[PDB]
Design a protein around this nucleic acid. Structure first.
Length: 184
RNA sequence: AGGACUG
């Protein structure tokens, strides 16, 4: 009992496709977990060579959830790297295409604690680590911490739903990137 | 990390 979400929430980027992968075989594969609305494998215009990547659009985000839960994916004898897609409009933010397991979580003030985060974020995946940042040499809480999962996808899914309310607070949740966000 | 490079 949902409406269609906007496209960005239903779209998958598939990296590391084999050269013999086509739209029909990619579509065949991802149709196991949902109805495909669009499917495209990007080619060199001159050579018509596959660029080794593509995009599938599911009809609901739930189907993306299901397909991601089914990993790993072998399409044409090669394990592919599927990720929630990055909008054309955000493709050039620093660190846009970088896959990480570490979630940033700010906006939490001083009353928020590891158990609030665990309890809240448990429902997205297996957590490895939770660290609430206290001040170096004061122990004063700094308003933020880091959740690290065993997989990148809970992070991506979390950040895609950008609105999260935790311990009463509006939390800022982003990826925790080092200066790996340096690319031109 | 995008099809219309069909601007």
């Amino acid at each position: 009992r949902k409406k269609r979400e906007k496209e960005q929430f239903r779209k998958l980027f598939i990296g590391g496709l084999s050269f013999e992968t086509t739209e029909e075989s990619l579509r065949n594969y991802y149709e196991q977990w949902g109805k495909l609305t669009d499917c495209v494998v990007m080619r060199d215009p001159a050579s018509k060579r596959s660029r080794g990547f593509g995009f599938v659009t599911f009809s609901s985000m739930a189907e993306v959830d299901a397909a991601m839960a089914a990993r790993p994916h072998s399409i044409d004898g090669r394990v592919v790297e599927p990720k929630r897609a990055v909008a054309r409009e955000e493709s050039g933010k620093p660190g846009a295409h970088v896959t990480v397991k570490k979630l940033f979580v700010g906006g939490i003030k001083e009353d928020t604690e590891e158990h609030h985060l665990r309890d809240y974020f448990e429902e997205y995946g297996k957590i490895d680590t939770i660290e609430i940042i206290t001040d170096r040499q004061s122990g004063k809480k700094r308003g933020f911490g880091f959740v690290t999962f065993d997989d990148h996808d809970p992070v991506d899914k979390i950040v895609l739903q950008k609105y999260h309310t935790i311990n009463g607070h509006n939390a800022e949740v982003r990826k925790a990137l080092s200066r790996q966000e340096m690319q031109e």
